[PDB]
């Protein structure tokens, strides 16, 4: 098989071999071992053949696979491997390197394959193996398809062992006016064919003969034998009868624009609905022609024609003959004045490229399935509440949802995250950006899934992790700024409702902890809401959507969440102790994302992104907002008091057990808050200082950041060397961002003593290890565990303190190398 | 050199033209079309 790479010079032979092997695979009287061998051969061939050469096999599979019968299992695996291997050849605008780029026909076939498999699976009865095989194939095809691909031959009607079944045209009658048109079109076809035989050097002769080179039937119409003339017409009569059979109408009332003199048909334009008519009519011709070959094969007793595949599947060049000559017939109808009526076709012909995008269609289907999911989840809740013993009528829908849509959503929005976050001004991905409609639809999907899973983690059972992962991915893929600034009121209300419900649930959890609906709320919160809310806040902060998203009602809900979490953090319960890390991370992300300096309420008047500025004083009265921003909720101390308390604890040398709230919640919140407002406060790099600039809404400075870093280092040093401290890694991760603003004096004041203590401890432990190795038998065997534990705690301390040192060194190394520094040299020694 | 001391000097890298008594000569891709013999291994064109 590997030798088949680069065989494009024998593409016809390779295609014939592939088709023959596939036909053998679909073989009766074949033992299981023989079928396995054939399938292995086919997969090996497709693993190495170039993607451009598998187009015809793909065309066959487009028809065969969507049936999803027993024979469809191997093609599913083949397509999965093929698209996983060659996703670049289809997705990237440049295509796969050295392999070219896909064609529009190949993309159309891929889209047809995806939607056929999707619909068949959606309507199929559940089967474990079928679903397991099919889901990866759908994921691979979706990943290969470009999100913004638009099908040139889009079809809203979407009509429909190949059985070509043309419409019955012989039965339908032919009007006399259409008979007149039949005569005129017969004359025109006579003229065009006469031009052609003049090209061939044939003229009117007595009898047909290749050597004689004269066609007897070619002659003037008046002298043309009447018997041959309706033989000439009959294809046209059959065509028109078929048109009438489809309820297509033509009325000559209005008018529109031997020697061969056929009027040129190319000059006259052709409408797009007319083009679709021609495509359908050529489809019927292909049906009749395939029916003729089907009768031939039936007479033979078997066999399959190579071109028995559907007309739409046939690429452009193969369609060309029938398409063009149907164009000719319809055009002549036009010059005779026969403009055919559309009806269903013309009210189907609508929409735009945005609505034709593959991602648009996929998201629309996902939203419809979200509605279905809401319905069957309500039904499942009802049956659980009463009539516990019964069989759900939505078993198939439940299984399809859980075992297809969730993995599919996860994979698809992992792959195409950057496409949905891109904007016309700034493009993040390789190419293309989601439209406003697509962004709104993905926002609606996220909100609907969150509402679905709310207070139902137990109900979802083993699928709750999948739902939560999908929510994570959707949040990471959400573009909230565009949706909030310019989006439908319904989508905006959905997002606002999500935030309000999150705040309410967190308040309920907080009050319950302070002291089974309680259990339901607790499990839901800690399992789905806090992680998903943390991810959403982190995404907002990373993409700087805070100023545009968290405003007005969202701002009020964020206030409630923030200070309810802060109030909870003060209590002392085993459950609170277990929950503090997650609450601290959520508060850190919320503080990074908030657009209002909630720790500096005295400067709020200068904040443009504040509810007390955006909403008039008459407003905020229909809401329950208090008169002054200070009273939003006062339990959170101001920045000065917070820093004073942190410094006091650090100097007093308290251990972790004496301030679990501070270390786990307050310090991460400050570490996320101070960097955010340093850029917007004084001392920041001013882009607008030359122009009129309002006073900053914050007083944060490098002094504040340096003081916080010093206090954090002092706290770590105070807790150095204790038996158990799992909070050190979290504190180091949270404090890493503030290191960039540290002052040079920190090296001598804090870092040198700390690393000195660590070095002294390491020296002591290695000395003890040497003494142990000097010892023997039980003396060495016991105490090895003791020095093991000492090394473990030393490694914990080193990993707590070294990331901060690494950031400090990265920021200050240039200065040290430029100017020799004895303190830096001492640090190097340690 | 503006950043050689900060990175490269201690790592042991040497400036490209450190011990050259004359500036390094340079060539550039001139976009003036010129006639050249057809290569004997041109992928697309063959002359017999």
Please report residues of B whose CB lies closer than 8 A to that of A818: 5-6
Please report residues of A whose CB lies closer than 8 A to that of B4: none
Q: Which residues of A touch B (CB under 8 A)?
A: 813-814, 817-818
B interface mutation test: which of A812, A814, A824, A825 has the most B CBs within 10 A? A814
**Residue B44 C-alpha, separation from nearest chain A C-alpha, in angstroms:** 15
Closest CA relative to residue A755, chosen from A708, A791, A720, A709: A720
CB contact under 8 A, A813 and B10: no
Please report residues of B whose CB lies closer than 8 A to that of A814: 6
Query: Which residues fall within 8 angstroms of residue A358, CB to CB, at 6 or more apart?
Result: A111, A145, A146, A147, A148, A149, A150, A151
Q: To the nearest 10°, report the CA torsion of A457, A460, A462, A465.
A: -50
The span from the CA of A456 to the CA of A459, in Å, is 5
Q: What are the φ and ψ backbone dihedral angles of A245, each rounded to 5 degrees? A: -60, -40
The span from the CA of B10 to the CA of A641, in Å, is 46
The span from the CA of A445 to the CA of A370, in Å, is 8
The span from the CA of A787 to the CA of A776, in Å, is 15
Query: Which residues fall within 8 angstroms of residue A281, CB to CB, at 6 or more apart?
Result: A239, A242, A243, A326, A329, A330
The span from the CA of A253 to the CA of A817, in Å, is 93
**Residue A815 C-alpha, separation from nearest chain B C-alpha, in angstroms:** 8
Helices (H) and strands (E) counted in chain A, each on its own, are 38, 0
Query: Can you state the angle between helices A73-85 and A55-64, rounded to 10 degrees?
Result: 140
Residue A443, H or E segment: helix A436-453
The span from the CA of A155 to the CA of A451, in Å, is 34
Reported in sequence order, the residue ranges of A215-351 that DSSP labels E, i.e. its strands, are: none
CB contact under 8 A, A814 and B10: no
Please report residues of B whose CB lies closer than 8 A to that of A817: 5-6, 10
Residue A193 tokens, joined: 């064919």
Chain centroid to CA A262: how far?
54
Nearest CA in chain A to B6: A814
CB contact under 8 A, B5 and A813: no
Nearest CA in chain A to B10: A817
**Bridge partners, A100 (sequence order):** A96
**Residue A745 C-alpha, separation from nearest chain B C-alpha, in angstroms:** 21
Residue A59 tokens, joined: 């065309």
Closest CA relative to residue A743, chosen from A705, A800, A686, A698: A705
**Residue B6 C-alpha, separation from nearest chain A C-alpha, in angstroms:** 6
The span from the CA of A603 to the CA of A697, in Å, is 5
Angle at A529 between CA A527 and CA A530, to 5 degrees: 85
The span from the CA of A634 to the CA of A565, in Å, is 13
Nearest CA in chain A to B3: A814
Cα-atom radius of gyration of chain A, to the nearest Å? 37
Residue A395, H or E segment: helix A395-400
A interface mutation test: which of B3, B6, B10, B43 has the most A CBs within 10 A? B6
The span from the CA of A103 to the CA of A111, in Å, is 12
The span from the CA of A661 to the CA of A570, in Å, is 6
CB contact under 8 A, A818 and B5: yes
**Residue A818 C-alpha, separation from nearest chain B C-alpha, in angstroms:** 7
Q: Yes or no: say if A440 and A483 are a contact pair by the CB < 8 Å rule.
A: yes
Helices (H) and strands (E) counted in chain B, each on its own, are 0, 0
Q: What number of residues does chain A have?
A: 830
Please report residues of B whose CB lies closer than 8 A to that of A819: none
Q: Yes or no: say if A114 and A149 are a contact pair by the CB < 8 Å rule.
A: no
Residue A155 tokens, joined: 């079809």
Query: Can you state the angle between helices A226-245 and A272-300, rounded to 10 degrees?
Result: 110
The span from the CA of A616 to the CA of A612, in Å, is 7
The span from the CA of A416 to the CA of A439, in Å, is 12
Please report residues of A whose CB lies closer than 8 A to that of B5: 817-818
Residue A200 tokens, joined: 């061939």
Q: What are the φ and ψ backbone dihedral angles of A266, each rounded to 5 degrees? A: -75, -30
Query: Can you state the angle between helices A702-718 and A667-678, rounded to 10 degrees?
Result: 160
**Bridge partners, A63 (sequence order):** none
Query: Which residues fall within 8 angstroms of residue A509, CB to CB, at 6 or more apart?
Result: A521, A522, A525, A526, A568
CB atoms within 10 A of CB A611: 23
Closest CA relative to residue A578, chosen from A613, A626, A627, A526: A526
Say which residue the tokens 């039937």 belong to: A217
Q: Which DSSP string corresponds to A684-736? A: S--SSSSS--PPPS----HHHHHHHHHHHHHHHHHTTT-S--THHHHHHHHHG
Count A/B contacts: CB-CB distance under 8 Å.
7
Q: Which residues of B touch A (CB under 8 A)?
A: 5-6, 10
B interface mutation test: which of A812, A817, A821 has the most B CBs within 10 A? A817
Closest CA relative to residue A674, chosen from A709, A650, A644, A634: A709
Q: Yes or no: say if A563 and A641 are a contact pair by the CB < 8 Å rule.
A: no
Q: Yes or no: say if A499 and A533 are a contact pair by the CB < 8 Å rule.
A: no
Q: Yes or no: say if A681 and A696 are a contact pair by the CB < 8 Å rule.
A: yes
Nearest CA in chain A to B8: A817
Please report residues of A whose CB lies closer than 8 A to that of B6: 813-814, 817-818
């Amino acid at each position: 098989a590997p030798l088949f790479a680069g065989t494009e010079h024998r593409a016809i032979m390779v295609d014939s071999m592939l088709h023959t092997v596939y036909r053998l695979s679909r073989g009766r009287s074949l033992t299981k071992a023989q079928r396995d061998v054939i399938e292995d051969c086919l997969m090996a061939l497709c693993r190495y053949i170039r993607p451009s050469m598998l187009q015809h096999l793909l065309r066959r599979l487009v028809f065969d696979v969507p049936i999803l019968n027993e024979f469809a299992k191997m093609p599913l695996k083949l397509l999965t491997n093929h698209y996983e291997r060659c996703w670049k050849y289809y997705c990237l605008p440049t295509g796969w390197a050295n392999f070219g780029v896909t064609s529009e026909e190949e993309l159309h076939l891929t889209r047809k394959l995806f939607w056929g498999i999707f619909d068949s699976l959606a309507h199929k009865k559940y089967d474990q193996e079928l679903y397991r095989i099919a889901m990866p194939c759908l994921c691979a095809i979706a990943g290969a398809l470009p999100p913004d691909y638009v099908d040139a031959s889009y079809s809203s009607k979407t009509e429909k062992n190949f059985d070509p079944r043309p419409v019955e045209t012989l039965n339908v009658i032919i009007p006399e006016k259409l008979d007149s048109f039949i005569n005129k079109f017969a004359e025109y076809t006579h003229e065009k064919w006469a031009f052609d035989k003049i090209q061939n050097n044939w003229s009117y002769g007595e009898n047909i003969d290749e050597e004689l080179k004269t066609h007897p039937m070619l002659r003037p119409y008046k002298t043309f034998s009447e018997k041959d003339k309706e033989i000439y017409r009959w294809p046209i009569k059959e065509s028109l009868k078929a048109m009438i059979a489809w309820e297509w109408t033509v009325e000559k009332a209005r008018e529109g624009e031997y020697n061969p003199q056929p009027p040129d048909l190319s000059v006259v334009t052709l409408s797009r609905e007319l083009q679709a008519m021609a495509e359908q009519l050529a489809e019927n011709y292909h049906n009749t022609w395939g029916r003729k070959k089907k009768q031939e094969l039936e007479a033979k007793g078997g066999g399959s024609h190579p071109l028995l595949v559907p007309y739409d599947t046939l690429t452009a060049k193969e369609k060309a003959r029938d398409r063009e000559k149907a164009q000719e017939l319809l055009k002549f109808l036009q010059m005779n004045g026969y403009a055919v009526t559309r009806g269903l076709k013309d009210m189907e012909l609508d929409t735009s490229s945005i609505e034709k995008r593959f991602a648009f269609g996929f998201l629309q289907q996902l939203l419809r399935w979200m509605d279905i999911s809401q319905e069957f989840i309500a039904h499942l809740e009802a049956v659980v509440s009463s009539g516990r013993v019964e069989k759900s009528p939505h078993e198939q829908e439940i299984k399809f949802f859980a075992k297809i849509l969730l993995p599919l959503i996860n994979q698809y929005f992992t792959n195409h995250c950057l496409y949905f976050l891109s904007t016309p001004a700034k493009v993040l991905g390789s190419g293309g950006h989601a439209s406003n409609k697509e962004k709104e639809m993905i926002t609606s999907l996220f909100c609907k899934l969150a509402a679905l899973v709310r207070h139902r983690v137990s109900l979802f059972g083993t699928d709750a992790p999948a739902v939560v992962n999908c929510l994570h991915i959707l949040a990471r893929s959400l573009d909230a700024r565009t949706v909030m600034k310019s989006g439908p009121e319904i989508v905006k209300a959905g997002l606002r409702s999500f935030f309000e419900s999150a705040s309410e649930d967190i308040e309920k959890m907080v009050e319950n902890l302070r002291l089974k609906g309680v259990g339901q709320n607790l499990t839901y919160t800690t399992v789905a809401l806090l992680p998903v809310l943390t991810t959403l806040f982190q995404h907002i902060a990373q993409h700087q959507f805070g100023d545009d998203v968290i405003l007005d009602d969202v701002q009020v809900s964020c206030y409630r969440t923030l200070c309810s979490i802060y109030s909870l953090g003060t209590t002392r319960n085993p459950y609170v102790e277990k929950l503090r890390p997650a609450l601290g991370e959520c508060l850190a992300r919320l503080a990074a994302a908030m657009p209002v300096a909630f720790l500096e309420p005295e400067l709020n008047e200068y904040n443009a992104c504040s509810v007390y500025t955006t909403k008039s004083p008459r407003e905020r009265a229909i809401l329950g907002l208090p008169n002054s921003v200070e009273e939003m909720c006062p339990d959170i101390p101001v920045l000065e008091r917070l820093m004073a308390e942190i410094g006091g604890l650090a100097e007093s040398g308290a251990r972790y057990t004496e301030m679990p709230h501070v270390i786990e919640i307050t310090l991460p919140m400050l570490c996320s808050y101070l960097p955010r407002w340093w850029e917007r406060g004084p001392e920041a790099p001013p882009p607008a200082l030359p122009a009129g600039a309002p006073p900053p809404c914050t007083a944060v400075t490098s002094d504040h950041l340096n003081s916080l870093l010093g206090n954090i280092l002092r706290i770590i040093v105070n807790n150095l060397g204790i038996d158990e401290a799992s909070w050190m890694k979290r504190l180091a991760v949270f404090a890493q961002p503030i290191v960039s603003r540290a002052r040079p004096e920190l090296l001598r004041s804090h870092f040198i003593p700390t690393i000195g203590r660590l070095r002294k401890r390491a020296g002591k432990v290695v000395a003890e290890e040497e003494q142990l190795r000097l010892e023997a038998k039980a003396e060495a065997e016991e105490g090895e565990l003791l020095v093991r534990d000492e090394f473990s705690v030393l490694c914990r301390d080193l990993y707590a303190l070294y990331p901060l040192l690494i950031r400090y060194v990265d920021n200050n190394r240039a200065h040290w190398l430029t100017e020799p520094n004895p303190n830096a040299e001492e640090l190097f020694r340690m | 050199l503006r950043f050689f001391a900060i990175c490269g000097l201690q790592e042991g890298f040497e400036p490209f033209a450190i011990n050259m008594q004359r500036p390094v000569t340079t060539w550039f891709s001139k976009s003036l079309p010129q006639f050249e013999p057809v290569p004997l291994e041109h992928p697309h064109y063959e002359v017999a």
